[PDB]
């Protein structure tokens, strides 16, 4: 109460406090060495303990923003290292804090972080767990200044858990490696979603966010009253608006409040918030944001009652348009947890466009009478794609499914670079393996979650190295139109084939020692180049070539003087293949 530092220290706990303070400093002073930050953390922690012992001790009354800023301005090489940022220190709070936010660089120039060999890690881990973990916490945090700290803390613990379980295993690598790769992706996805959610808010505006949230919060809490959901969407919008601005403290308090509000009213929101609400102040938010959907009420009316058959439709709509559309969304979303949020938005958009026409016409009811028929094809498009694509993935495996997508998209946008096409298709493939395992009722929400990040990543690259107007149309298109726009792309009739290049199709024995992962990316790269050269090739033609290449390899890696083989049969394969594809 009287001392903020003392208060947070007591809430968080020493360990958590020390880690958060470290992350906080690493995100601002992204250039200072690790031992320098460690020094700061200790100084702040010691200060904190003083305040815990006596809330009236010097400076214990200062605000976290103030203490933090002062400490920051302490750094002697502040001007020589961060130049312009040092001028913030001449300002008074809150301009000082505001000034610091502005100079935090989003994408700093730091070397890629390379993964050491399992044995060095595990020994480092054992020989000095604290510094090994904090050292990486530091390296990761300085590279993602915008990654919400507590979230970064949750990942660290997932990492600690992996080293503990695996560094004792019989086959460390067999245990750890796959774990590290899983965490990396989750970390990447989490980072992407965060940037995405804020970028989306800037572009599309508050209304669109509120809509997306109404739909999402309604699928998850089907039993809550519309007024509660509204209350929540309202507060949730402030929270995200604030958290995007970047101030960790402000963000942290807004989220905490929201979580407490939710827990106090849990029995009037959802029956699934029990476990989450018991957890520590530091984990509540995270938990709730991931809670599973509650059971939807058994006795639920027909949507057509209040939205198609009622006589006061246009009257209720004209009176408060967005509120009316929100109720529609609410009602429609909580009966369809199986729908993707964006799909629900499309229906809402459709119902809106209809009421706008119909309520201005002679006899409204007559005009908007069959709107639910409008929805049918809208709902079906995403459903057929899932069925069709999961079936294909069922037959072929992940890898072969990835090759299928490779041929499919190269033909649609041959202008894209081969490395980019490879990454996209591979990740598209992963989405297929990760979601197709789910029961049909949960597939769509799954694909949407994963596809959103992949589509955004694809758009960002392209944004930097523009290549196709079509991709640009889809990338800058409506939030709700993005995926449909890509789905609508057709083979590029215009495209002009790339001239043959012997090199591009020559292979060496080294391919035999390449890691399974790199072997594929090598074959898949050739495949893309193959299509870019012979775009009019049919599935039959291609499949045959791919079959030869397949054999080609297995054969040359299981024979003496491998080198000769590849260069000898290579002439043959390539010569025959060119002939078959005219
Ligand atoms: C070359 O392939 C990658 C891919 C993703 C990567 C990194 C390197 C690095 C390392 C680097 O920046 O060089 C980081 C930090 N990545 C993340 O996005 C991330 C974020 C949060 C967590 Cl918890 C874990 C991972
Ligand atoms: C509970 O309320 C929300 C609100 C926005 C959301 C999400 C959930 C989720 C999570 C989910 O879909 O369950 C994602 C991925 N959001 C966005 O990226 C986003 C951000 C801004 C706009 Cl304008 C539109 C969409
Ligand atoms: C743009 C992504 C939104 C994710 C998110 C979420 O689902 N909940 C959320 C969950 C249920 C009701 C309302 C919001 N809160 C959340 C906010 C503060 C504290 C705890 C959870 C979130 O930030
Ligand atoms: C998330 C904070 C805890 C840090 C633990 C990370 C230890 C593993 C080091 C490898 C990280 C580089 C990312 C990768 O390519 O795997
Ligand atoms: C500078 C010392 C204070 C450390 C700053 C970090 C404070 C974070 C408070 C943790 C609250 C969890 C919020 C949430 O649920 O997301
Ligand atoms: C508080 C409830 C507000 C809900 C407003 C409903 C709007 C539905 C249209 C979907 C918005 C996507 C943006 C668009 O393309 O128009
Ligand atoms: C497997 C990969 C293909 C997934 C099918 C796309 C379905 C997209 C659902 C999201 C949306 O409604 O736009
Ligand atoms: C560049 C490659 C384009 C990738 C398009 C992904 C769209 C996924 C939806 C599936 C589909 O309809 O094809
Ligand atoms: C001009 C024709 C050159 C022939 C080169 C064929 C390269 C395509 C790579 C085929 C890899 C398919 C993957 C697999 O076999 O599993």
Curated annotation (Swiss-Prot):
<feature type="modified residue" description="N6-succinyllysine">
    <location>
        <position position="434"/>
    </location>
</feature>
<feature type="glycosylation site" description="N-linked (Glc) (glycation) lysine; in vitro">
    <location>
        <position position="411"/>
    </location>
</feature>
<feature type="binding site">
    <location>
        <position position="247"/>
    </location>
    <ligand>
        <name>Zn(2+)</name>
    </ligand>
</feature>
<feature type="glycosylation site" description="N-linked (Glc) (glycation) lysine; in vitro">
    <location>
        <position position="442"/>
    </location>
</feature>
<comment type="subunit">
    <text>Interacts with FCGRT; this interaction regulates ALB homeostasis. Interacts with TASOR. In plasma, occurs in a covalently-linked complex with chromophore-bound alpha-1-microglobulin with molar ratio 1:2 and 1:1; this interaction does not prevent fatty acid binding to ALB.</text>
</comment>
<keyword id="KW-1015">Disulfide bond</keyword>
<feature type="binding site">
    <location>
        <position position="253"/>
    </location>
    <ligand>
        <name>Ca(2+) 2</name>
    </ligand>
</feature>
<feature type="site" description="Not glycated">
    <location>
        <position position="39"/>
    </location>
</feature>
<feature type="binding site">
    <location>
        <position position="1"/>
    </location>
    <ligand>
        <name>Cu cation</name>
    </ligand>
</feature>
<feature type="site" description="Not glycated">
    <location>
        <position position="370"/>
    </location>
</feature>
<keyword id="KW-0488">Methylation</keyword>
<dbReference type="GO" id="GO:0005504">
    <property type="term" value="F:fatty acid binding"/>
</dbReference>
<feature type="disulfide bond">
    <location>
        <begin position="73"/>
        <end position="89"/>
    </location>
</feature>
<dbReference type="GO" id="GO:0051087">
    <property type="term" value="F:protein-folding chaperone binding"/>
</dbReference>
<keyword id="KW-0446">Lipid-binding</keyword>
<feature type="glycosylation site" description="N-linked (Glc) (glycation) lysine">
    <location>
        <position position="437"/>
    </location>
</feature>
<keyword id="KW-0677">Repeat</keyword>
<dbReference type="GO" id="GO:0005783">
    <property type="term" value="C:endoplasmic reticulum"/>
</dbReference>
<feature type="domain" description="Albumin 2">
    <location>
        <begin position="185"/>
        <end position="377"/>
    </location>
</feature>
<keyword id="KW-0964">Secreted</keyword>
<feature type="glycosylation site" description="N-linked (Glc) (glycation) lysine; in vitro">
    <location>
        <position position="197"/>
    </location>
</feature>
<feature type="glycosylation site" description="N-linked (Glc) (glycation) lysine; in vitro">
    <location>
        <position position="49"/>
    </location>
</feature>
<feature type="site" description="Not glycated">
    <location>
        <position position="387"/>
    </location>
</feature>
<protein>
    <recommendedName>
        <fullName>Albumin</fullName>
    </recommendedName>
</protein>
<feature type="site" description="Not glycated">
    <location>
        <position position="2"/>
    </location>
</feature>
<feature type="glycosylation site" description="N-linked (Glc) (glycation) lysine; in vitro">
    <location>
        <position position="571"/>
    </location>
</feature>
<feature type="modified residue" description="N6-methyllysine; alternate">
    <location>
        <position position="532"/>
    </location>
</feature>
<feature type="site" description="Not glycated">
    <location>
        <position position="522"/>
    </location>
</feature>
<feature type="glycosylation site" description="N-linked (Glc) (glycation) lysine">
    <location>
        <position position="231"/>
    </location>
</feature>
<feature type="site" description="Not glycated">
    <location>
        <position position="473"/>
    </location>
</feature>
<feature type="glycosylation site" description="N-linked (Glc) (glycation) lysine; in vitro">
    <location>
        <position position="321"/>
    </location>
</feature>
<feature type="binding site">
    <location>
        <position position="65"/>
    </location>
    <ligand>
        <name>Zn(2+)</name>
    </ligand>
</feature>
<dbReference type="GO" id="GO:0005507">
    <property type="term" value="F:copper ion binding"/>
</dbReference>
<feature type="site" description="Not glycated">
    <location>
        <position position="134"/>
    </location>
</feature>
<feature type="glycosylation site" description="N-linked (Glc) (glycation) lysine; in vitro">
    <location>
        <position position="543"/>
    </location>
</feature>
<feature type="site" description="Not glycated">
    <location>
        <position position="210"/>
    </location>
</feature>
<feature type="site" description="Not glycated">
    <location>
        <position position="572"/>
    </location>
</feature>
<dbReference type="GO" id="GO:0015643">
    <property type="term" value="F:toxic substance binding"/>
</dbReference>
<feature type="disulfide bond">
    <location>
        <begin position="390"/>
        <end position="436"/>
    </location>
</feature>
<feature type="modified residue" description="Phosphothreonine; by FAM20C">
    <location>
        <position position="81"/>
    </location>
</feature>
<keyword id="KW-0862">Zinc</keyword>
<feature type="site" description="Not glycated">
    <location>
        <position position="498"/>
    </location>
</feature>
């Amino acid at each position: 109460h009287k001392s903020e530092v003392a208060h947070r220290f007591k809430d968080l706990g020493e360990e958590n406090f020390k880690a958060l303070v470290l992350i906080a400093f690493a995100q601002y002073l992204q250039q200072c060495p690790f031992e320098d930050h460690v020094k700061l953390v200790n100084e702040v922690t010691e200060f904190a303990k003083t305040c815990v012992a006596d809330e009236s001790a010097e400076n214990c009354d200062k605000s976290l923003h103030t203490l933090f800023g002062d400490k920051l301005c302490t750094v002697a090489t502040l001007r020589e290292t961060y130049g312009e940022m040092a001028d913030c220190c001449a300002k008074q709070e809150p301009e000082r804090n505001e000034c610091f936010l502005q100079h935090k660089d989003d994408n700093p120039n730091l070397p890629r972080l390379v993964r050491p060999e399992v044995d060095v890690m595990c020994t480092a881990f054992h020989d000095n767990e604290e510094t090994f973990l904090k050292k990486y916490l530091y390296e990761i945090a300085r590279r993602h200044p915008y990654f919400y700290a507590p979230e970064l803390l949750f990942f660290a613990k997932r990492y600690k858990a992996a080293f503990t379980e695996c560094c004792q295993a019989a086959d460390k690598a067999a245990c750890l490696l796959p774990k590290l790769d899983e965490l990396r992706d989750e970390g990447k996805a989490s980072s992407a979603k965060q940037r995405l959610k804020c970028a989306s808010l800037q572009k599309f505006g508050e209304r669109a966010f509120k809509a997306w949230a109404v739909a999402r919060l309604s699928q998850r809490f089907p039993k809550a009253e519309f007024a509660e959901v509204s209350k929540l969407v309202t507060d949730l919008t402030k929270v995200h608006t604030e958290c995007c601005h970047g101030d960790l403290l402000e963000c942290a308090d807004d989220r905490a409040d929201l979580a407490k509000y939710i827990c106090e009213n849990q029995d009037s929101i959802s029956s699934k918030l029990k476990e989450c609400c018991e957890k520590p102040l530091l984990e509540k938010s995270h938990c709730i944001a991931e809670v599973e959907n509650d059971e939807m009420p058994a006795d639920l009316p027909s949507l057509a009652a209040d939205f198609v058959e009622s006589k006061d439709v246009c009257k209720n709509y004209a009176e408060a348009k967005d509120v009316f559309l929100g109720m529609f969304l609410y009602e429609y979303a909580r009966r369809h947890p199986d729908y993707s949020v964006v799909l629900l938005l499309r229906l809402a958009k459709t119902y809106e466009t209809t009421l706008e026409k119909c309520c201005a016409a002679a006899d409204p009811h007559e005009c908007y009478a069959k709107v639910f028929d409008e929805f049918k094809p809208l709902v079906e498009e995403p459903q057929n794609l899932i069925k069709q694509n999961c079936e294909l993935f069922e037959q072929l495996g992940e890898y072969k499914f990835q090759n299928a997508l490779l041929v499919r998209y190269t033909k649609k946008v041959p202008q894209v670079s081969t490395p980019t096409l490879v990454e996209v298709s591979r990740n598209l493939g992963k989405v297929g393996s990760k979601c197709c395992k789910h029961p049909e009722a949960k597939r769509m929400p799954c694909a949407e979650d994963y596809l959103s990040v992949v589509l955004n990543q694809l758009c960002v690259l392209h944004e930097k190295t523009p290549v196709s107007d079509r991709v640009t149309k889809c990338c800058t298109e409506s939030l709700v139109n993005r995926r449909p726009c890509f789905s609508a792309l057709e083979v590029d009739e215009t495209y002009v084939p790339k001239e043959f290049n012997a090199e591009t199709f020559t292979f060496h024995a080294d391919i035999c020692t390449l890691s399974e992962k790199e072997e594929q990316i090598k074959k898949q790269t050739a495949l893309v180049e193959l299509v870019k050269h012979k775009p009019k090739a049919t599935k039959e033609q291609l499949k045959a070539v791919m079959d030869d290449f397949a054999a080609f390899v297995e054969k040359c890696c299981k024979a003496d003087d491998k080198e000769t083989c590849f260069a000898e049969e290579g002439k043959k394969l390539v010569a025959a293949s060119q002939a078959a594809l005219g």
